[PDB]
């Protein structure tokens, strides 16, 4: 539970600075054509918020990328590519730490058992003789 807690924090930080990168990436070379929302790195948060809000308003910018930077198909695929690669693993990573706990515990539960049945079998003999 608390073990995996730190794991996501560093990953989200990777993701945070993955943002800082893609913000530094996007802003510079996507502005001057449609520079209302591509001046500041803030636009990447917007871009997040955009994606959170299922933008389809960069569809506009995508029409503008078809007019201005068709490469942006990549630099839209990029935001999509970067997000999934990030968010899944941070989740999977935790799925794993979630799935990793119980298997030990299952064996942990079975751990105490075999010895008990043995610790049982041992004193079980001590009556038919003593």
């Amino acid at each position, epitope marked *: 539970l608390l073990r995996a807690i730190p794991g996501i924090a560093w990953i989200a930080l990777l993701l945070l600075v993955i943002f800082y990168v893609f913000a530094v990436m996007g802003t510079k070379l996507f502005a001057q054509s449609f520079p*209302e*929302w591509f001046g500041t790195l803030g636009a990447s948060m917007y871009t997040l918020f955009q994606v959170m809000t*299922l933008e389809s*308003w960069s*569809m*506009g*910018i995508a*029409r*503008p990328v078809i007019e201005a930077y068709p490469w942006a198909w990549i630099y839209f695929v990029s935001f999509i590519l970067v997000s999934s690669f990030t968010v899944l693993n941070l989740f999977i990573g935790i799925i794993i730490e979630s799935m990793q706990s119980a298997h030990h515990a299952e064996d942990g539960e079975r751990t105490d058992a075999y010895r008990d049945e043995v610790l049982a079998r041992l004193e079980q003999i001590d009556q038919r003789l003593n």
Partner: antibody
Amino acid sequence: VQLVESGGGLVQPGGSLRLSCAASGFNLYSSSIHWVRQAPGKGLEWVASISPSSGSTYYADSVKGRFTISADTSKNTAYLQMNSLRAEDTAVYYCARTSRGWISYGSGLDYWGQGTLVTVFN
Amino acid sequence: SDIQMTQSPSSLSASVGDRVTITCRASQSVSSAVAWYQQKPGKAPKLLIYSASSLYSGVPSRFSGSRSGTDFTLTISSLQPEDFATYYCQQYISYHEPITFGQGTKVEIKR
């Protein structure tokens, strides 16, 4: 709230009239105002849009440059100079705020301006 | 980008109390941020439906708008005194190149 719609009238071609829009019961400075003309027996035509906090030079292809819309925050006042009329643009024009600011809708027409009838042919 | 809010039908004559649906077709991927408004003749715009569902503060419940991707449709079931009306959509970008409002739907009262 109240929208100030004035500066209409009849004129001849090549003429340039400045359609004034002053802010009343709303901070335009954060808001954004758009202009759209209703031809007789026709619907709206989203002309332009703007301080929009940031200075959004936003205007439709129909009057692309032929008109230039702006505003004075200091007076809570806006303007729309439709130059170069053509008479094609002869239609009753009303300016309003679909503002993405603090005081208006953001979703659409927060209100409607009184509208002043412009007849550009003599 | 480009937008062409094709509203239908042309002539819409109906009796009072009846249920009426004003439909509009989107050219490209128009989002949830759809707007429709109705105004009496020589009367100011009245924003009807905000975000394609939200009635403006004071807007009666008598009318409502639905979304079906490309198809966006407004509907009213009970004729209000404002029976005779018009209907045009409005397609928005949060802040982007394309701006468009509807080609208009004449809502006539059939006598």
